[PDB]
Symmetry: C2
Subunit: 84 residues, 2 copies
């Protein structure tokens, strides 16, 4: 919401914006609110689940997203050697 994030021409680049909308836990409603509360990927992944719950307004979306952010490429690949 700073001078750099406020788009004059207002195109909305379908790279990073769309990048959100394809993530589990994201809808356009909470994407736009997100978009105002986060910079991009870095800060999005830096945000806690609780922050996402505040932005998205649902712990469902927040958990889905937060979990997707933390799910290692080689995590779910295992079935549960260390049973949690």
């Amino acid at each position: 919401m700073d001078s750099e994030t406020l788009p004059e021409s207002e195109k909305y680049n379908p790279g990073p914006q769309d990048f959100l909308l394809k993530m589990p836990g994201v809808n356009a409603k909470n994407c736009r609110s997100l978009m105002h509360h986060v910079k991009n990927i870095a800060e999005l992944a830096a945000l806690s689940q609780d922050e996402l719950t505040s932005i998205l307004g649902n712990a469902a979306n927040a958990k889905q997203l937060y979990d997707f952010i933390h799910t290692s490429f080689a995590e779910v690949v295992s079935k549960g050697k260390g049973k949690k």
Copy 2:
């Protein structure tokens, strides 16, 4: 790397794996390398371009990816920061 990372099913869950591969600056060679240096999205977005150049071995890929990680959804659109 530990027993943690060792895939039982060796499925390689496509979701986050492919999530990398679609990012500008990511190729399978540097993705696999990344995959060994990065947990998931959070660590990727936490890593600096220095780290990316080390992992990917290319400054080109590192710069492309670093840019993508740190460019707000509307930042490319914002003519206040860049462009003419």
